[PDB]
Symmetry: C6
Subunit: 59 residues, 6 copies
């Protein structure tokens, strides 16, 4: 039990806005989180998003 | 197991992002890779890799 | 340990790179740091650090 | 050996920090961790992430 | 894990698409965890993998 | 886990930085994450993450 380990895993199943490093914004639902990836649904599309490409997430 | 960023928990700071934005933020949590903040009525998860520096 | 990218092996995907390029790519291999693809007749080694996201 | 770094040898020194965003910090170094450099810049206190630094002149 | 496909490029002549838009026509002479050593014409370069977007071979 | 950059210690090199700058340098030290150089009269600590490639 390490409380301050990874906050991103708590986003699984949630509606979020993902702000990517190039300025793109994803209105997403999170469908999975790994150490390095966040899986999302955006509209009809399924995306694997690398965390290194994310600047911040609004939730 | 030491990070200076942990010293900023609960504090008002200015986060200078790699995208050029400056967040007027209250820090609500610090993990190894993330900083959780309140900016106005918004809750953000900020990745440390996207931060250039923090003024405190 | 676990990664979702390995499950894309054998799929045809759209890889959106950090430079704004998109690759219409058949995935032929995945390692911790790399994704091997065929794009048309070209064979590429793509570094995961250069990928923003993948549509599958 | 493990965790040797030159950056902590700049601890307590006046330096110029050239950031990836084009900014140059005229800085006094007050602490160095594995991933961060703490600095005073004039009357400002900054936590600078090493990943945002291109090079440091000392 | 901790397999690298890049090691198999040793001895090949490849196109390295760098993160800034430059492209190197490069003979690979060595590969480490973080670096690719190349010959580009008469020039010897150490290329950091973090600066590479992709490699065509 | 080997690194080629260590063998640049003491050598004249040209360092091509991610910002488009080029350093005509002599290497004075190499660590896991840093390369120390002299450029003319200036002493610099260069982070490897900021380097694209090195001509030597
Ligand atoms: O256990 C881990 C490992 C990595 N990351 C995320 O992945 C990024 C690594 O991206 P890269 O620069 O290594 O490609 C980290 O900055 C962090 O955001 C995590 O959240 N947890
Ligand atoms: O234990 C760790 C691991 C990573 N980081 C921060 O997360 C960043 C990861 O960025 P990246 O791996 O995406 O490049 C590091 O540069 C550092 O600022 C930490 O603070 N502590
Ligand atoms: O065991 C690992 C190591 C790395 N990565 C991902 O690959 C990136 C590095 O790949 P590359 O493009 O940098 O070669 C990491 O930041 C992370 O996103 C993984 O998924 N698993
Ligand atoms: O033990 C460490 C870990 C990281 N760093 C610096 O922090 C950066 C964090 O980037 P990354 O490893 O997250 O990609 C490294 O590139 C390096 O400049 C160090 O100096 N020592
Ligand atoms: O064992 C390793 C360690 C790193 N890398 C590559 O080197 C990069 C290091 O650069 P970065 O972590 O600073 O982006 C990794 O992202 C990955 O592409 C490997 O291929 N194998
Ligand atoms: O043992 C290491 C660790 C890092 N690096 C360099 O520092 C960069 C950032 O460190 P990291 O992201 O691999 O931790 C890497 O891309 C690589 O160029 C090395 O040469 N050797
Ligand atoms: Cl929180
Ligand atoms: Cl393959
Ligand atoms: Na981070
Ligand atoms: Na980084
Ligand atoms: Na850092
Ligand atoms: Na590298
Ligand atoms: Na580095």
């Amino acid at each position: 039990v390490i409380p301050n380990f990874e906050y991103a895993r708590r986003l699984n199943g949630k509606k979020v806005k993902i702000f990517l490093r190039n300025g793109e914004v994803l209105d997403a639902e999170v469908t999975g989180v790994s150490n390095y990836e966040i899986m999302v649904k955006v509209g009809d599309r399924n995306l694997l998003v690398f965390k290194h490409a994310i600047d911040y997430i609004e939730y």
